[PDB]
Design an enzyme around this catalytic site. Structure first.
Site, mmCIF file in Angstrom:
data_model
loop_
_atom_site.group_PDB
_atom_site.id
_atom_site.type_symbol
_atom_site.label_atom_id
_atom_site.label_comp_id
_atom_site.label_asym_id
_atom_site.label_seq_id
_atom_site.Cartn_x
_atom_site.Cartn_y
_atom_site.Cartn_z
ATOM 1 N N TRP A 1 0.878 -1.154 0.000
ATOM 2 C CA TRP A 1 0.000 0.000 0.000
ATOM 3 C C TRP A 1 0.924 1.214 0.000
ATOM 4 O O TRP A 1 1.582 1.505 0.996
ATOM 5 C CB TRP A 1 -0.877 -0.041 1.252
ATOM 6 C CG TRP A 1 -1.953 0.986 1.286
ATOM 7 C CD1 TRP A 1 -2.898 1.213 0.332
ATOM 8 C CD2 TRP A 1 -2.226 1.907 2.351
ATOM 9 N NE1 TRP A 1 -3.749 2.216 0.735
ATOM 10 C CE2 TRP A 1 -3.358 2.660 1.972
ATOM 11 C CE3 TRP A 1 -1.625 2.167 3.590
ATOM 12 C CZ2 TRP A 1 -3.904 3.659 2.789
ATOM 13 C CZ3 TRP A 1 -2.170 3.162 4.403
ATOM 14 C CH2 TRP A 1 -3.297 3.894 3.997
ATOM 15 N N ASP B 1 -0.810 -3.544 10.731
ATOM 16 C CA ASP B 1 -1.760 -2.612 10.159
ATOM 17 C C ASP B 1 -2.985 -3.499 9.967
ATOM 18 O O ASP B 1 -2.960 -4.429 9.151
ATOM 19 C CB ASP B 1 -1.268 -2.090 8.810
ATOM 20 C CG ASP B 1 -2.256 -1.141 8.161
ATOM 21 O OD1 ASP B 1 -3.467 -1.312 8.380
ATOM 22 O OD2 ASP B 1 -1.839 -0.232 7.422
ATOM 23 N N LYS C 1 -13.755 0.167 7.215
ATOM 24 C CA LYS C 1 -14.337 -0.876 6.386
ATOM 25 C C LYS C 1 -15.342 -1.805 7.071
ATOM 26 O O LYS C 1 -16.478 -1.920 6.615
ATOM 27 C CB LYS C 1 -13.215 -1.702 5.730
ATOM 28 C CG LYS C 1 -12.371 -0.960 4.672
ATOM 29 C CD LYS C 1 -11.543 0.168 5.275
ATOM 30 C CE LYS C 1 -10.535 0.788 4.290
ATOM 31 N NZ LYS C 1 -9.157 0.542 4.726
#
Ligand SMILES: *Cc1c(COP(=O)(O)O)cnc(C)c1O
Ligand SMILES: *Cc1c(COP(=O)(O)O)cnc(C)c1O
Lengths: 396, 396
Positions: B130, B211, B246
């Site tokens: 990412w 993460d 999310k």
């Protein structure tokens, strides 16, 4: 990795909250943080805000990410509020606003932005001032200098010492000004003085940075921006960090803005891209709820009317407490004259008490104020006024 | 001051949003950002969340500032969710959590914290990975190295190359692992591999940084943390940055957390003070609404039941689209075999398309994906599947 990490020093302001939630002594008085209270000693949710939250609850259909710069409407209305309905900066499109997490977050962003996209090396803050200012710019790698401001003897703004203080300021240097309701003195420049400063600013090549956290608490929304607009009328560039925590009572929703002004739209847009870059590597997108509330209110004639009246009530209640405070001190056998406190506007008043007196107030009477002698007038109610004034008279 | 400021490069991910809101071509397909969609192609507000917002609207009596570390309840429940009901880290009180503005804000905070309170000089991120990860740690002044991870030829996790990649990692170095639903490969380590990594980690003296942005989208809440808990069982120290954007669909409310673990409560508390210092000079306090919602839901048996079922529905719909995607490609005359896509879990799938193919997809068909070939499976509906698969088959 964390074996030798040193315990951090307490924040002179936020740290007070901690000592409060550790003191049993029933009857404490919190005159520390700048949070508004009503006659009850409560920090209620404004009615306009509740109605606005009602609206969002019924009309929101998604929580999908906002753009890096936040809600577009929020920005426009923030700009109108600062510069005025028919401002040239708006017509010429020389301003760009980014919705940020509180007024503090706006300063953080302005700071990160300056540090790595301009040649700024120093920032001039006032003394006395707001300690966080120094901490924020220092963490960004910028050095902080201070300029004189308060006349501790006459309880007024020492303009001469301010001017002579800023002569040492070089071009390309940033000068931070409190929009209104200076923290903590409560003493603001007069329109004539703002004009002289705006004039002086241009001639020396300083980059003005306004911190606007109490717009509406001095005299009024439009009136409180006279200083900023005076500068805005003569500058090609400037940065405005504003907060909605106080005038909207949205403290924990973290609603603020960072406005950037440039000579033309081509420049401000180019610079704004770097500000957005600065934001992306921080928190990515700003929190929606708080700003949505603010935009909803400002864009709705009905809700805005209610809000403006609520802001007026807060401003007035503080003014009443300010007068009730002085009288009660005399009436209670006050040593010196505190009439100067009426001259100060905003939530705070620079009492003049020493660090020891303040230390004794919380130690012996459970009265909490910031070591600097700053007291939150908005924390005074008709109910705590007496015990509060008696303790102050006992340490004088 | 802003005359020569250079225009910032577009964000490889967020930038897609911009191109989308500038393309008229009706019939576009957004497979860029990792945001969930339902059969409709909408990103609705979960029902549990609405009911929670309902509750707050009726029970909130103040917006007064939250402590620097956020809502205490939020932190406890975040800790239980990550480590498990009877985790030792909790009983021993070796963990401290700070409510942060999104999972990105947590990384920002962890980064600022490490940079100026520990000797960490490097951070090891995965490749592919990412992009924001690198940008965040770089802005904090830390250098970023990369370790191998994906086997582009067999569409699997190249454990050998990963291990040999991290041998160059020195003790005191930080290694960042995706908790689950690796971005963008969708390939996660097996429990046995996590164990081998946890073991390897201790022996080399690395500081693990997890993460966790998609907990609940791979297999389940408890299952998705097996990796993290495997490490947590052998480490004295570690940092967890998690997001609720999310699994709660709270994207714009910016709800995340930064959890710090130390050997004992004395150490974690001492270190945590410096993290709070790091937060104070950034945004001061975290936004309340989003986290309040999360705490309300998790602490209410009823609301939690509903939420867990909504999370399960999202996870399942993505799985259905993943299968519908493969079949439709074959059925539409797909060149190669995409069966490997079923092996990947989460919202994303590493398609394998080249930068040119992806560029052509948006240019000629209005299909938007990230240049890396990563596509958001959660953005596929039964309605856009056909035109979507036909365009992909046209650039193969
Ligand atoms: C309250 C205040 C701010 C900003 O507060 P936020 O809670 O971050 O919005 C900034 N400057 C001064 C002088 C303040 O008093
Ligand atoms: C979505 C995501 C995050 C964090 O997102 P926030 O919106 O900041 O909560 C972090 N890491 C990865 C890999 C992600 O996909």
């Amino acid at each position: 990795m964390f074996e030798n990490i040193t315990t951090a020093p307490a924040d002179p302001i936020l740290g007070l909250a901690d000592l409060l939630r550790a003191d049993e002594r029933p009857g404490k008085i919190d005159l520390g943080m700048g949070v508004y209270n009503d006659e009850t000693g409560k920090t209620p949710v404004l009615t306009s805000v509740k109605k606005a939250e009602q609206y969002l609850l019924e009309n929101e259909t998604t929580k999908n990410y906002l753009g890096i710069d936040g809600i577009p409407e929020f920005g426009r209305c923030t700009q109108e509020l600062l510069f005025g309905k028919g401002s040239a900066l708006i017509n010429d499109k020389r301003a760009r606003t980014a919705q940020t997490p509180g007024g503090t977050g706006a300063l953080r962003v302005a700071a990160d932005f300056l540090a790595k996209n301009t040649s700024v090396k120093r920032v001039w803050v006032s003394n006395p001032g707001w300690p966080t200012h120094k901490s924020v710019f220092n963490s960004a790698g910028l050095e902080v200098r201070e300029y004189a401001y308060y006349d501790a003897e006459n309880h007024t703004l020492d303009f001469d010492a301010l001017i002579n203080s800023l002569n040492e300021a070089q071009a390309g240097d940033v000068v931070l000004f409190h929009g209104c309701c200076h923290n903590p003195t409560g003493i603001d420049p007069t329109l004539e003085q703002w004009q002289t400063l705006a004039q002086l600013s241009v001639e020396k090549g300083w980059l003005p940075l306004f911190d606007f956290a109490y717009q509406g608490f001095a005299r009024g929304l439009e009136e409180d921006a006279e200083g900023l607009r005076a500068f805005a009328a003569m500058h090609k560039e400037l940065i405005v960090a504003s907060s909605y925590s106080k005038n909207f009572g949205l403290y924990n929703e973290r609603v603020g803005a960072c406005t950037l002004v440039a000579a033309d739209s081509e420049t401000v847009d180019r610079a704004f891209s770097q500000m957005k870059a600065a934001i992306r590597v921080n928190y990515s997108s700003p929190p929606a709820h708080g700003a949505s509330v603010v935009a909803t209110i400002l864009s709705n004639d009905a809700l805005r009317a209610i809000w403006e009246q609520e802001l007026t009530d807060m401003r007035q209640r503080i003014q009443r407490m300010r007068q009730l405070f002085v009288n009660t001190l005399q009436e209670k056998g006050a040593n010196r004259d505190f009439s100067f406190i009426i001259k100060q506007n905003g939530m705070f008043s620079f009492s003049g008490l020493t660090k020891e007196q303040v230390l004794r107030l919380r130690e012996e009477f459970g009265v909490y104020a910031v070591a600097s002698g700053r007291v939150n007038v908005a924390g005074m109610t008709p109910d705590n006024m007496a015990p509060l004034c008696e303790a102050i008279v006992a340490v004088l």
